[PDB]
Amino acid sequence: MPLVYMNIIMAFAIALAGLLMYRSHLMSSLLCLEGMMLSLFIMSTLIILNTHFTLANMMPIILLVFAACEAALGLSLLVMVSNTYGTDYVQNLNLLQC
Amino acid sequence: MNPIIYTTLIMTVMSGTMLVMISSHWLLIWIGFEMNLLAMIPVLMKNFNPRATEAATKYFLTQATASMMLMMAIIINLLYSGQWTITKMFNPVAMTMMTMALAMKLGLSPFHFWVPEVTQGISLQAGLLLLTWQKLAPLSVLCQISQSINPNLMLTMAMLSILIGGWGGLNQTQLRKIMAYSSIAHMGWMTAVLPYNTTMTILNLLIYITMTLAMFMLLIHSSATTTLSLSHTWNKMPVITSLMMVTLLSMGGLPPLSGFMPKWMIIQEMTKNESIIMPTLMAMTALLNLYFYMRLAYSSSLTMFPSTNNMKMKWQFEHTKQMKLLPTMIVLSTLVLPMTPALSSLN
Amino acid sequence: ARQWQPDVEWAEQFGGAVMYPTKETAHWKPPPWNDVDPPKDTLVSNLTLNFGPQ
Amino acid sequence: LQYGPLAFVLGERTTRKLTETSKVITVDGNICSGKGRLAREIAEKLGLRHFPEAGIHYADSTTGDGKPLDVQLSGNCSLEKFYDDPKSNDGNSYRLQSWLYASRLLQYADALEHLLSTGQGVVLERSIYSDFVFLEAMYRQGFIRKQCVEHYNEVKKVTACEYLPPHVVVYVDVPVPEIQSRIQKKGNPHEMKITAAYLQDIENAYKKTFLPEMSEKCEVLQYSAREAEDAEKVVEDIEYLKCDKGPWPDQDDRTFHRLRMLVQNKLEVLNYTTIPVYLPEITIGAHQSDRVFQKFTELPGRKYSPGYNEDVGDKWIWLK
Amino acid sequence: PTIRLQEDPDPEDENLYEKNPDSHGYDKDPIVDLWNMRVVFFFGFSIVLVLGSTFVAYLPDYRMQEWARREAERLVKYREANGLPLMESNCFDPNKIQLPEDED
Amino acid sequence: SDAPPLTLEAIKDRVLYVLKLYDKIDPEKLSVNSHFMKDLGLDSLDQVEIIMAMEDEFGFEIPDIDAEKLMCPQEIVDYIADKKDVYE
Amino acid sequence: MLKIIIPTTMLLPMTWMSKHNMIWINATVHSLLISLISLSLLNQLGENSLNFSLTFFSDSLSAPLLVLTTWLLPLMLMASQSHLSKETTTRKKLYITMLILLQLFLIMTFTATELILFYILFEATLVPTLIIITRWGNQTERLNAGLYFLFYTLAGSLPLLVALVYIQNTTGSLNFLIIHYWSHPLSNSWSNIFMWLACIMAFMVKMPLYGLHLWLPKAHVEAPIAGSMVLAAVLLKLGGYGMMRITTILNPLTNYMAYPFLMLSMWGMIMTSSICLRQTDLKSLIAYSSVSHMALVIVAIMIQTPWSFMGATALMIAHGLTSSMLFCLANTNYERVHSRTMILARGLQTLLPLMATWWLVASLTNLALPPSINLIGELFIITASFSWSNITIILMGMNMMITALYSLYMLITTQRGKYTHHINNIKPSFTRENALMALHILPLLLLTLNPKMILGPLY
Ligand SMILES: CCCCCCCCCCCCCCCCCC(=O)OC[C@H](COP(=O)([O-])OCC(O)COP(=O)([O-])OC[C@@H](COC(=O)CCCCCCCCCCCCCCCCC)OC(=O)CCCCCCCCCCCCCCCCC)OC(=O)CCCCCCCCCCCCCCCCC
Ligand SMILES: CCCCCCCCCCCCCCCCC[C@@H](O)O[C@H](CO[C@H](O)CCCCCCCCCCCCCCC)COP(=O)(O)OCC[N+](C)(C)C
């Protein structure tokens, strides 16, 4: 493979680890989700352009649309959490246990 | 919520699940999952409270992570083969990502932590939907790619799911958490047989869905979410408690009840493949689920707990809303063992 | 002589937030009867601004 | 077509029936005050439906035949023996208070259902909002325990928050000596034993907690004993009130639909009255509970659903 | 109240002999009691025990013991009438048995 | 779990600690029975500061009417024990 | 075989359609009629079994057990109706329904041709017994007793299910006829050893084997009278019947796989007989005596000789009848004095002479007096053990001595001496109780005249 493929894959891995490891702010994790989506977009676009598969040139656009849907969902949930607690910290979300 | 809006959201959830069901293209399956999650998030929050908000947030985070892993696996599979069809993945790493993603979507161990909390934080109707309808799509995807799964990882996750479901259910007094741990154990049982026979997985899915629907409807009818609240139902609706006790015995897998048939068929199918140790451990561990079912039956129907004075006023009122399918679900959850050979129609 | 039935003390074993109470989970309190927690006094401070003199 | 989501979707709405005369009205006052006559007169003048004060057997009036049932099958409390022995070690006092709160909750649900379904207004004597004055009076007189007050507060917190407060709160003011004098002139031997401290506690609870609390979300009309006989004047005072204070103007079709779904289905209304809090005064053992439940089921029209008891003349059961 | 709960007191068990000096211990209703005793006695002692024992005693010899005795008598008579041994140490004919040809 | 079952000895030790940390008091001439106004020579304003230090130490507010009675460390310890429901 | 099953099912709507005051009469009459009908299965062919159809068959081993179950149901109904007089009509009908379902599962269990159906019914017997014990038990320990009874059984039974499905996969069938005719030896391997254990331990724990018997005292003491009757008389015999059916395919491994079980059974029968000597509860003594008798049955099954199986069958039948009679005798006194302590009520022979006669006869049958069938089975088992090894006679004689000792100890403690002074509520024996004892005891003595009916297929 090209080394750019490894760079994009490691970008995805770093963003996934950033999401999986949580600091105080909820907003930081949403940004990590958006970063994973961006890396997926870049990787899929590179794969589609390299192989000249004409019909999937539209697939990353659909990816972006559902990324926007995910981001809107996350922001709405953050609005409700911050309205409840006055802060978007994840440690406030501990009313429910296992 | 406007009833029209609620109907539209439920139809959107169902249509996303059906899109996952009928698609031949990986992108369309991903789209179905995305639409299902998007329409599912408001349903968890229909009755607004901080607990519902927290449950919805945890659910969204878990499912979004699973969706990201799903898409990454699809992209790897495309990279190593210019294929979009869901037939059999061509890369072991992509397949491992796919398995981890689908297990996180299903709530299999060790990705089980979200299920009890989300189930506890929502209403009983949302819990019913989450524990019945939300399992169809990832299970269908796993059924389509069954020949590609690594048996070691899948069976490890299934055994962990059964063990953790039993142990977690041992410690619960809230009914929703009990049902969530029961769901985790049943998912483990279902995914244990998937690498060998998808028909067994489908049969286990159908029986588990029937029993879970009957149990959740019985819990809605007697509007209780804790053990002590359900302990009062004998003094107002003894028939409901008796049906609950019989359904609980069925869920424990005791013959000649219906819940025994999926475990029996899974064990015999696994023995056909020279797998003896793991089904033995699986049954010996489902003994724990039977134990906490029996504890609930002791507290609910077989003995009579003390009641309160205000129950006399409740004695004078009937149920305004009646559930149409509750009688059928109870009968199918209990008395369908003699109809076992009908499973051939599932393949 | 009559059959024994559970009483208040027996029933109270299942009234806790969790079975098998340990030292750490003893401070866990059962959730409210309805699934509504009481609102927190997290007063959002308004922003104070000096409008003028310059 | 029973009211539900289907009825709300096609056609049926609540706001289209509000006609400026709905005005949930409660006419409160101390013991033996003429609040009942004033409330009935207000209902007759304004054309609203009148609700007599909810007693021990209010639920009996709404189910089956309107006849009351036996005390041990309904209520399991006596107001007379509360006057006789308020400190009895059988828990009669708090049992009576909790049963009366449940009855008032049921009556409030019925009145709200009537107003939301027909648009016609309702008039209530007391309410779940003013029920706590008797609880406070009992607690200050040493009639109930602190735990009983805590259980009452829990039940009220989980129940009364689901409903809209009345538009108009009418308080009939009678000084405690006049209350006592009316008490002796009445003739009931049990009410003769009501001490002045108990009535003073009720009046203090009213004037220090209830009226200031309702004045923030409702408009209050106070009337002395002498000026409470002028029903026309009170009605004229009500007819010239601007209801721009409480949450009622903040109500649209969706909140009305939720409230109408809640006011019917009385089991959902009463759900949180029987919460598993084991107070000795209200906890009933398994044997007594079983015996009383069987005896209730042996009542002539209570074994089956309303239209399915053939011994009270129901017909075509095999085709229902 | 110093009490924990509202409970009915444990009642005293009532003697069936008190209202019915000859009460058979089957039921509170004397007529139902008498008929319960009668049906129990008739369908247990009269129908099952005696008639069933007679039926079992006169069960036909399906076990083939008299037949076995007669067959044994015939075989013994035939065998010692000719000087043949009464029984062979071999149950099956050695001529229809094909042992492995070599033992070493 | 939460904090251990606080006892009288720990309360008394903490009270003497916060009093010895107060600069207008002799570290060695201070006793559990010393009187602030007479034994230590402290002014009323000084006493108010001490009560405020106690409120900081034990994490709960003290009204003025209760504070005016508190004229020695033993009274402070007894008041804290009564408010926190500590018998030993 | 349908001529037995269908009336048993018809017992359910018949008792659900009866009047509130006729349920006991109707159920008893039709249960007795069903027992009379089932009595016709004792006609056995000798050479082979009676194969009614593909699903059911009757053997010389199954027929006495079926007759015992059908005969036990009316006795259970007669014993139950006294302590259930205050119950509502619906709950009494539910109790009778539990009894009828238990009878149906038992009669289907003993006649199944195929081992998976046998397993399904043999597990299905659990639910009615559990419901009876945990709902109509008297004390607060019934919940713990039910949990013990359920989980001890299931922990042994699940490996049996795994072994059965594996065996059907490897052989191609589990039908008992095909299993017997196509039997092949089990080699000496770890896989075969664990297959043997999985095929044996469920029936071991149902007997129960000593060391796995802790559930039995709890369940038998804490259950109502009918529950104890069915637990001791019939449900203990499921393990023995299963062993006799399953050891056909276990040879030649049983030759040495039975050593720990034989050792446990002999020493534990000694231990339980000794335990019976120091017991303060009257029902626990009967339970432990049952454990000792079933240990002797386990030895008989393990040694694999025709005389051993004949003695085991006779001992199973005799023990069932005797244990049911003893439990009913204890229940009468418990109903009198509302306590299970043996020394609370003494000298009952002075107050109840006929019940004392019933006590004496039950104690004599418990110690296996000749020529009762109890001693027939015990003597056959002892002779088979002596053939197995001459040193077994020491343990057999010790067990006989201790059995006589605690049997007569119970009789003397309960019936002899002087009456307790303060106890003054001991009424004369009812006709129902005397009839129940007579209906227990008379078949026992009548079976002596025709011992071959209960000796089994090896006869
Ligand atoms: C009671 C209430 C309290 C509680 C009760 C508790 C009990 C509950 C019981 C529950 C129900 C149980 C049901 C069991 C059913 C059993 C049926 C059965 O299997 O029958 C078999 C069997 C019938 O045999 P079979 O297979 O029909 O035989 C057919 C033959 O091929 C051909 O035979 P054959 O041609 O020789 O015919 C003979 C024929 C005719 O034989 C004769 O007439 C000739 C006799 C000789 C007469 C010679 C003198 C008279 C003539 C000359 C004098 C007048 C003229 C000369 C005048 C001269 C003047 C100077 O009469 C007979 O067949 C014999 C009588 C049969 C009676 C069977 C009765 C069974 C009843 C079953 C139900 C019982 C329920 C209880 C109530 C029973 C009723 C009270 O009956 C007997 O076994 C009878 C036993 C006889 C024993 C003989 C003595 C043996 C002594 C050995 C022991 C020595 C030591 C001391 C031991 C003492 C032990 C007592
Ligand atoms: C209380 C007062 C007591 C004093 C009064 C006592 C009166 C006298 C008592 C003594 C009587 C002694 C009787 C001796 C036996 C005589 C009859 C005997 O010979 O018949 C036997 C018959 O016995 C029966 O066959 C066996 C009894 C069957 C028992 C079935 C009971 C019914 C079922 C009840 C439920 C059972 C549940 C448990 C079952 C497993 C043996 O038959 P057999 O010698 O061969 O027959 C030869 C001729 N045949 C073959 C043509 C008939």
Ligand SMILES: CCCCCCCCCCCCCCCCC[C@@H](O)O[C@H](CO[C@H](O)CCCCCCCCCCCCCCC)COP(=O)(O)OCC[N+](C)(C)C
């Ligand atoms: C309280 C009551 C509970 C129920 C009791 C159940 C009893 C179960 C016991 C099973 C009986 C014996 C099992 C197997 C038979 C022999 C076992 C072994 O010790 O024998 C030797 C086996 O050699 C070694 O000992 C291997 C076994 C050593 C490991 C086993 C651990 C035993 C420790 C005891 C643990 C307790 C077990 C029960 C837990 C409750 C024989 O030597 P060898 O001829 O070469 O091997 C024969 C097998 N081949 C043919 C396949 C080769």
Ligand SMILES: CCCCCCCC/C=C\CCCCCCCC(=O)O[C@H](COC(=O)CCCCCCC/C=C/CCCCCCCC)COP(=O)(O)OCCN
């Ligand atoms: C309530 C108390 C009762 C307890 C009873 C529990 C004992 C049950 C007996 C053992 C259970 C497992 C048996 C497995 C089913 C047998 C099927 C079989 O024979 O398959 C074996 C498989 O054998 C095994 O895998 C057995 C391994 C053991 C797994 C679980 C071990 C748990 C503990 C075992 C010892 C305890 C059992 C006796 C204890 C009794 C109670 C104390 C061979 O198959 P193949 O792989 O094809 O080999 C031939 C081709 N190469």
Ligand SMILES: CCCCCCCCCCCC(=O)SCCNC(=O)CCNC(=O)[C@H](O)C(C)(C)COP(=O)(O)O
């Ligand atoms: C960060 C920099 C801050 C600097 C700015 C600070 C400015 C704040 C100034 C505010 C001044 C006031 O409030 S003025 C306070 C009001 N009045 C008085 O102080 C005089 C009357 N009081 C008495 O005479 C008492 O007896 C007494 C002598 C106290 C004895 O007390 P004890 O014997 O009971 O201890």
Ligand SMILES: Nc1ncnc2c1ncn2[C@@H]1O[C@H](COP(=O)(O)OP(=O)(O)O)[C@@H](O)[C@H]1O
């Ligand atoms: N919540 C309550 N607690 C205790 N007693 C009550 C309560 N509500 C009503 N009562 C009783 O109702 C009795 C008379 O009712 P009231 O309205 O004061 O007089 P009137 O019949 O003239 O309207 C009084 O004795 C009073 O104690």
